[PDB]
Amino acid sequence: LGNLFKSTNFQSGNTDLVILVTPRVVSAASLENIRQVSQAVEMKDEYRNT
């Protein structure tokens, strides 16, 4: 019953953050470059089909 004679203000929250990196010695034929090249091909095909 005391809530009829009382007012409450409540705040709560949290933030999570991670930053991580990965270096690799590559060439133009390396897997890291090939995947990005193939991603661009799919981007062009998706544009063409709309």
Binding site: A40, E46, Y47
Partner: protein
């Protein structure tokens, strides 16, 4: 007695650059927005003893 050439014929390089970008977005706003702060009850008293 030998003399140099006026300039050296360099090699020519062709550069091909491709930039691709795709953006997508959604926006939703649905429901009923009620009032959250309303007036409460009141009471007053007044008297003249003398």
């Amino acid at each position: 007695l030998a003399t140099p050439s006026p300039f050296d014929m360099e090699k020519m390089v062709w550069l091909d650059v491709n930039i691709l970008e795709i953006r997508k977005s959604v926006l939703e706003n649905f429901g009923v927005d009620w009032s959250k702060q309303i007036p409460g009850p009141f009471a007053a008293f007044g008297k003249d003893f003398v």
